[PDB]
Each structure stands twice: as structure tokens, then as C-alpha cells.
Design a protein around this ligand. Structure first.
Ligand SMILES: [Mg+2]
Ligand SMILES: [Mg+2]
Ligand SMILES: [Mg+2]
Ligand SMILES: [Mg+2]
Ligand SMILES: [Mg+2]
Ligand SMILES: [Mg+2]
Ligand SMILES: [Mg+2]
Ligand SMILES: [Mg+2]
Lengths: 258, 167, 74, 170
RNA sequence: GGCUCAGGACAACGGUUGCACCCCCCGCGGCGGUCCUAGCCGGACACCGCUGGCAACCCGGCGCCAAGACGUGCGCGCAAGGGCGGGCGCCCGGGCGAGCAGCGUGACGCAGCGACGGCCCGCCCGGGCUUCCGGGGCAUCACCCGGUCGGCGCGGUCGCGGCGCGCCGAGGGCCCGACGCCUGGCGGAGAAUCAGGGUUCGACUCCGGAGAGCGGGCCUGCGAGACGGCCCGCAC
């Protein structure tokens, strides 16, 4: 038993959906605690170095970040291991590039470019309502943020729109049958569909049945069902509309691209 | 040192398990406070640095406490005279050692100074016109550094009166 | 050696060795410190006022429901 | 009238328990404030009870009983959470505890056959239930109540006389 | 982080639950009201100067000086704990499957923050324990256990608990193999072999556990019963 917390991370023990080469090295970056957890995040350096390719080493990324060249939800971050998560705003003014971090059908993080009109807010999932000091009602979300004095009409598992400049709630979408959702965990990450059924078991998990646009049906637990509007998405989504092709069609697409 | 780990016990079949590691600091214990009634000397309370930087205070000597008469909603700070009954053992009584559940006699002055003029339970009033009132301890000295309680009421009062009357 | 001292000025003759070397004075308040303290006080007052206003408007709302909070005493 | 009768029995019992001087301590329900028993009227409740919440129903014996048990799931201060299981009674000799027998199957791949296995599980039995050997019980998981006990009985179904012992997976 | 596998055979470990019995640094987001000289408080030590002890290791005395160091502390009432506050066969908001949280009110106590403003709350990683299933061989080991099994009460603990103590009763396990003894016994993900069914191994790359000559004890700290940290016994 280790006598304290863990600070390192072996490369082979890192999450698969990070797509890290086996021979890159013994070690992988260890994300620091923040808005998102280890298994539902991706470090900034990976995006800035292994994807966009604006840097070729750790040091270059360190200089870029300490020179204030990236804003996360309107706030400059200088930590190369800062965790980036789902429905986050990634803006680089020096090149006028703005991206929203979402999931691809394969189950990995992707950068969807956005516009100026929709980059002043983000969507958050409310999963906990509790009373704080002095009995004051509170409310928490998936990105580690708390808001005091929420509307009584807002319940758990709902979705909340908040302005980036000011953490004030505008409108909220209820968790109900007939609402477009997006799956954010498990075997079905990145799929988009509409809720058709809700079944609860006393003392255990609650299972949600969803149907895709094409008629396919799939199941997942409520812990990773994210509402993204009322029958139509509230934000811009990837070019594909949450359709996972079968191995045959993916092979055809690969051969075509070959 | 003192520990409460279960590795040094026997199994449900009565077998010797065996030992596979040295002692750990999470599983430690400490010597009892043995809080004493006062009856260089004065109220003495110590402080203990517990896991996580948390602070725990154990009382070694004390003489006063807050007591409540629930039926009439009367509460004052009163001086504790001596311990008269304890279910665990009579040795604690002889030594006047304070623990949760001890039955004690308190001074009647703070209560009689305002009582004996309103209709209430006869028995508490008969105690009030005397020098002491039977009471109980509800806090945990050794963990919070205090000795509070409440005044006995009905069937429990009869139980303890019948217990201590022959003595 | 040469309380409630408004000017806060001082001497400088000190000692010299050529370069003049004198210890820097500590515990002196000028414009920066006074202004910083005043700004901090104003910020704290503003924060308290905003929180009180938010509580008042929340209480004004919920006219059709029940509330439980620690009443401010004194 | 019905309510008045219940309070008398509840009020009465607390006084015999005070006359049982052989006992060393006075046993009382923590929730109830001792003092209501001197109120001649019946405007204050004298007994505390709760609901398990998993679709089970509180026995009448608990509500109208006159016993004290801090480990009872209905009148006490413990909570049921986790796994619910079923078994048969194997022994009932301790004061408020029993041993439950559970039967299950184990598969062996090499021989493509099964073995019958059993385990013994101890549980706390509240005075609201009557149980004899061979009865079927439902046990709910609780916090550690002792060295070998983490379960409490919440339902009993009787079994008939001289019924042959049978292997009964549940 | 790195090394090794001595010890440990209902344990560790693997999968599956839970804390309505728990603790948690950095970081992210909030919140920020404190009972009874405030143009800025008080005294010291280190380095350093003079004088010195001892083979070495090690330090002594005198003396002016700083703080985001220590102490005191300006301020709209606020820490821990404690008493009282629901029903009438059951079920049909802050929150739950689940009477759980919070609040009011009668008494105690003045803990923490504050001489450039952080006490507190939530999340996160981590840890502690815990349900269920699996978890070596010998019957030239057949009966074993006596805090052993359960109950009541207190104490201690971050916390539940025979974890410890007092009292009471007698129990618990076993041919579906207990108890005892042995192992040139760390476990798993896996490796070798090759029709199919299987046999043998698994020090070593990843995860988890345990140890730093043997046996014990402890300070600092959120976190160590730590050993490139201290104290003792023994062997060197
Ligand atoms: Mg004051
Ligand atoms: Mg200070
Ligand atoms: Mg070995
Ligand atoms: Mg290892
Ligand atoms: Mg070690
Ligand atoms: Mg050591
Ligand atoms: Mg060494
Ligand atoms: Mg080390």
C-alpha cells in the first residue's frame, strides 16, 4: 500500500481513447484535479501537441501556455496537464480558432469548430441538489461548479445553459420522454437519439431506452445520458449526426479513402 | 502501540489466522481520559491532534454543566455534587468518575431560585425544596470536553430511586 | 530614535561606504497600502451587499412555497 | 377508544420494566422523550416506528409491541441497504440471533457437471418475529452489528411439521 | 519514483456491492456578516563580529538587525456538543427505495479568520473498512475453539465493530473435510505445449500486496507506525 496519493502514470495504464503510442515512452501525462476527472477528460498538451501539432515537445507547449495563448471557458490556463472535458469551449484568438469539445461516434474527443454567437455559453448536467451552510439551496454539475439559489423548477439530471461571462442560468431542459440526448459513457459514446422509455429498479440503476434517427435502438444507464435540447440540438455537432457504422461500412469507407 | 485491528484475533471457527504485516497508524488507540469530578486544582481540559488535523479535546477535571428540565422547559448551569449510580461498575461511582450515562446529584439553587411557585410535577418540586436533584449525563467527556445532561422524569426516575433507596 | 504619526516621512543620512547604503524602512504606510486597504474594504462591503440582495430577492420569490434559513440575529 | 387502549398498554409496560429491579439499566427508546408518560391525555405518541421502504410492510407486532431493540430495523436505529437474500433457518439458540443456511450450485468445466455447496450466514432476529428451524427468511444487509453479523431478518414464512429436509436454492 | 518476494494458505488477490458507520493536500467552482496604535503593534533567533572548548563528531558565551516567521489583535454573533419540536393499521418537498437533512427555541462555550483576509462548502484523485462468488496439499491430522459465540453498558477510534473493559447467557465450526501440520507458497492479467477435451508453470515489463539485518516504539506532517527520518535491545 502506497503511503500517499499517486503522482505518476504509466503509458500502458492510460485510457485507451487517448490514443497514445506504445513506444512513445514509459510515462504519460498525469492530469491534475479540476473540472473533470481522470477517465472523463484529456490533458491540454495532448490536444495542443499530438492533434493540432502547434508544438512538437513538452517545453514548447509550456512556453505557449505560460505566454497566455489559450482560453478555456474565458479564462487563461497555464497548466499543461489541465483537464479538458465534454462540452468545453476551446478558443485561440491568435488564429481565430474556436472549438467545442465533443465525442465522436467511435468514442473519442473531437474539436467541433463553432461561431461567435454560441460561444458565450455552455451546457451543464445537474446531478446533485443539496443544502449548504445556513440551509441555503445549492446545485452542482458535471464540470465541478456550484450555483446558489437555483429555480425550484430545476431537478436532478436536467441540463442547464449558463453564460460563460456570468455563471447565470438562462433556460433549462427537463429530463423527459421525447427529448434528444447524447450518450457520454460506455459502449455507446457519441450516439445521439431520442428517449423512448424509462424503467427504474428500487435500490439499483435506472435504465434508459433510446432510439436513433434511423430506427436503431440501444440501452444505457442514466449516469451517462446527456440532454442537448428539446427535440433539436442546441449546439453545433460533428459532421456526422451520431450514427455508428458497422464494420463492413467502415471498411468500405477505408478502402474508398485508400 | 494500542491498536484495534482485527488481525490479532481468532476466526469464527476459533482458529489462529496468522499475521502478514506490521502495525499501522490508522488502527491506533489511546489511553482513556478517566475524567474526574473535582468535588493547582481546577478545570483542566487537554487537546488532541487527530487524523486529518482535526482537534479533539478530553476533559480531565471539571465541576459544572448545563442541565435541562424538559417537561417545564427550564435549563440552567449547575454544579455537580457527586456520582451516585452507574450501571457498568460500582468502582467508577466510588472514584466519582464522569462518563455518559452516569447518574449524578446537582445543586438545586439555580432551579429553586425561580421554582416552587408554579404547578408542575410533584416529585421534581420535592427535590427542588431540598439540596440536590437527581439527573443524568448525556454528553461524552473525553471526546468533546463537556458534561451535560437532563433531569430525570418518570419511569426511569422510579427505577433509579428504587435502585438507590435501600443503600 | 530620531505612534499615530500622520506624515510617515523620515530621514536618510544613514551611513556611507563610494556607495551610500541604508536599510530600507519597514512598517511604513503610504498611498499604495492605504489605497489597497480601502479597496479591500469596499470590495468586502460590495460582496456582502450583493449577497444580501440575492437573499432578499430569493425570499421575495418562493411566495408559493416554504423556506428554511438561519435568521440573522442582532 | 382503540387508541386509548394502546396507550394504556404502552404506558403500563414502562412501569413493570421499572419494577424489574434485577435489571441493571433502564431500557428506553431513544427517539421518545421520557416525560410523555405522565400526560394523562393521549395527544403525544409513545412509540416510534418506521418503514423499510423496499415494498415490505411493517408488522403489527412491532407497532403494538412493548419491546426495546436498538438493532431492530423497524423500531430501532439501523437502516437496510445493499443486497436482499433468502435462506432457511439452521439454528436459533442465541438470544436475538440465528444462523441461516444458503444453498447454491458450482459448475466444474472439466467434468461438465455441478456440485452442491452451502454457507452459513448469521443474522439478528428482532422480537417481532417467531422462527423455528426450517423456516424461510428474507434478510437485509446492514452495518456491522458484531463480529459475524451484517444482516437483519425482515420477513418469515412458516414451514410445516416434519417436512423432509430438501435442497432449496433461493 | 526505483529494488526484491523473506513473511503470510476462509488471509493476500480477482470480479461484484456499500458507508443512511468514514478521512482527504494540490487543483476547479462557490461562499465570504464574528458577543464582551488600525497612516500600521510587541519581543526574539538565524547568518554575521569578538572571545573559546575538543583527536574527531560536535557545539558554548556576549553583542546591534528583517519577515508572507512567532505572539497580541481593530470586527454586523458565531465553531463542536447537548434538551425540546411528526403520526394512530399501511401506501398514494431539499432529497431518498428507505424519518434522512435543514430550521426554530431553552441553556452552555467563546474554538477558527483578521498589521498586505481566509475560516467554511461542493467536486476530483487517493485511502480505510465492508456484502456476494472464487481462492494449495496431507485423514499414518477426527473432532476443534473458551474473547472462543451472542446480548447489555461504557470507553477508544476518522469511523462501524469482542476493538478493549465490566456484567449476563451459553454458544459457534465439522466427511459439502473443521482443527492441526507441510510447502525449495506472493497473487492476478498471462506463458509453454497442441486435433477436441486438457497438463504444467506463473522471480521478472501492467495492476495489487508486503519488506528494507531481526524484534519493537515515535516525532513532523493532509498523508509515514517512514528507515538514502529519530529511540532501545540483540547479532555484526
Ligand atoms: Mg470581539
Ligand atoms: Mg501575523
Ligand atoms: Mg516464501
Ligand atoms: Mg509492482
Ligand atoms: Mg515500508
Ligand atoms: Mg521503520
Ligand atoms: Mg540504503
Ligand atoms: Mg524512501
Amino acid at each position: 500500500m502506497a503511503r500517499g496519493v499517486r503522482k505518476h502514470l504509466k503509458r500502458l495504464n492510460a485510457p485507451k481513447h487517448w490514443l497514445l503510442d506504445k513506444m512513445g515512452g514509459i510515462w504519460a501525462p498525469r492530469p491534475t484535479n479540476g473540472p473533470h476527472g481522470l477517465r472523463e477528460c484529456i490533458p491540454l498538451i495532448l490536444i495542443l501537441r499530438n492533434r493540432l501539432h502547434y508544438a512538437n515537445t513538452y517545453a514548447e507547449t509550456s512556453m505557449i501556455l505560460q505566454d497566455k495563448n489559450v482560453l478555456i471557458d474565458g479564462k487563461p490556463r497555464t497548466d499543461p496537464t489541465f483537464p479538458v472535458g465534454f462540452m468545453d469551449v476551446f478558443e485561440i484568438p491568435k488564429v481565430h480558432k474556436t472549438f467545442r469539445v465533443l465525442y465522436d461516434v467511435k468514442g473519442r474527443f473531437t474539436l467541433v469548430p463553432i461561431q461567435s454567437n454560441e460561444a458565450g455559453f455552455k451546457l451543464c448536467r445537474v446531478q446533485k441538489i443539496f443544502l449548504g451552510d445556513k440551509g441555503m439551496p445549492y446545485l452542482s454539475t458535471h464540470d465541478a461548479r456550484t450555483i446558489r439559489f437555483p429555480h425550484p423548477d430545476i431537478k436532478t439530471n436536467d441540463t442547464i445553459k449558463i453564460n460563460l461571462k456570468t455563471g447565470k442560468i438562462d433556460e433549462w431542459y427537463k429530463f423527459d420522454i421525447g427529448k434528444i440526448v447524447m450518450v457520454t459513457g460506455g459502449r455507446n459514446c457519441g450516439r445521439i437519439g431520442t428517449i423512448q422509455a424509462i424503467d427504474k429498479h428500487m435500490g439499483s440503476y435506472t435504465m434508459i431506452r433510446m432510439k436513433d434517427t434511423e430506427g436503431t435502438e440501444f440501452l444505457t444507464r442514466l449516469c451517462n445520458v446527456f440532454v442537448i435540447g428539446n427535440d433539436s440540438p442546441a449546439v453545433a455537432i460533428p459532421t456526422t449526426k451520431g450514427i455508428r457504422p458497422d464494420i463492413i461500412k467502415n471498411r468500405e469507407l477505408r478502402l474508398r479513402s485508400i | 502501540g494500542i491498536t484495534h485491528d482485527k488481525m490479532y484475533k481468532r476466526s469464527k471457527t476459533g482458529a489462529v489466522q496468522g499475521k502478514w504485516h506490521k502495525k499501522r497508524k490508522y488502527n491506533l488507540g489511546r489511553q482513556p481520559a478517566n475524567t474526574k469530578l473535582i468535588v493547582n486544582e481546577g478545570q483542566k481540559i487537554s487537546t488532541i491532534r487527530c487524523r486529518g488535523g482535526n482537534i479533539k479535546r478530553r476533559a480531565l477535571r471539571l465541576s459544572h454543566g448545563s442541565f435541562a428540565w424538559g417537561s417545564a422547559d427550564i435549563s440552567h448551569k449547575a454544579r455537580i455534587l457527586q456520582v451516585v449510580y452507574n450501571s457498568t461498575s460500582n468502582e467508577l461511582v466510588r472514584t466519582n468518575t464522569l462518563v455518559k450515562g452516569c447518574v449524578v446529584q446537582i445543586d438545586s439553587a439555580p432551579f429553586k431560585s425561580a421554582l416552587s411557585n408554579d404547578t408542575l410535577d410533584k416529585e421534581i418540586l420535592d427535590q427542588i425544596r431540598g439540596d440536590h436533584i437527581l439527573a443524568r449525563i448525556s454528553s461524552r467527556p473525553g471526546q468533546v470536553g463537556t458534561a451535560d445532561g437532563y433531569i430525570l422524569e418518570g419511569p426511569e426516575l422510579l427505577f433509579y430511586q428504587k435502585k438507590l433507596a435501600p443503600k | 530614535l530620531f505612534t499615530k504619526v500622520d506624515p510617515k516621512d523620515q530621514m536618510l543620512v544613514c551611513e556611507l561606504i563610494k556607495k551610500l547604503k541604508y536599510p530600507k524602512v519597514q512598517r511604513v504606510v503610504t498611498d499604495e497600502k492605504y489605497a489597497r486597504k480601502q479597496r479591500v474594504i469596499a470590495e468586502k462591503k460590495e460582496i456582502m451587499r450583493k449577497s444580501l440582495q440575492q437573499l432578499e430577492e430569493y425570499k421575495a420569490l418562493l411566495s408559493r412555497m416554504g423556506k428554511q434559513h438561519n435568521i440573522r440575529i442582532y | 377508544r382503540r387508541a386509548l387502549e394502546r396507550a394504556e398498554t404502552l404506558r403500563k409496560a414502562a412501569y413493570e420494566m421499572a419494577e424489574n429491579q434485577h435489571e441493571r439499566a433502564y431500557h428506553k427508546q431513544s427517539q421518545i422523550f421520557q416525560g410523555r408518560f405522565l400526560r394523562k391525555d393521549n395527544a403525544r405518541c409513545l412509540r416510534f416506528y418506521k418503514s423499510i421502504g423496499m415494498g415490505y410492510h411493517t408488522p403489527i407486532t412491532a407497532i403494538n409491541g412493548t419491546y426495546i431493540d436498538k438493532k431492530c430495523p423497524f423500531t430501532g436505529n439501523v437502516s437496510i441497504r445493499g443486497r436482499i437474500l433468502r435462506g432457511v433457518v439452521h439454528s436459533a439458540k442465541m438470544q436475538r440471533s440465528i444462523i441461516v443456511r444458503r444453498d447454491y450450485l458450482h459448475f466444474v468445466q472439466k467434468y461438465k457437471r455441478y456440485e452442491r455447496r452451502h454457507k452459513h450466514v448469521a443474522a439478528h432476529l428482532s422480537p417481532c418475529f417467531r422462527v423455528k428451524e426450517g423456516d424461510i427468511v428474507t434478510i437485509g444487509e446492514c452495518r456491522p452489528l458484531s463480529k459475524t453479523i451484517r444482516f437483519n431478518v425482515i420477513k418469515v414464512e412458516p414451514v410445516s411439521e416434519a417436512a423432509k429436509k430438501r435442497f432449496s436454492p433461493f
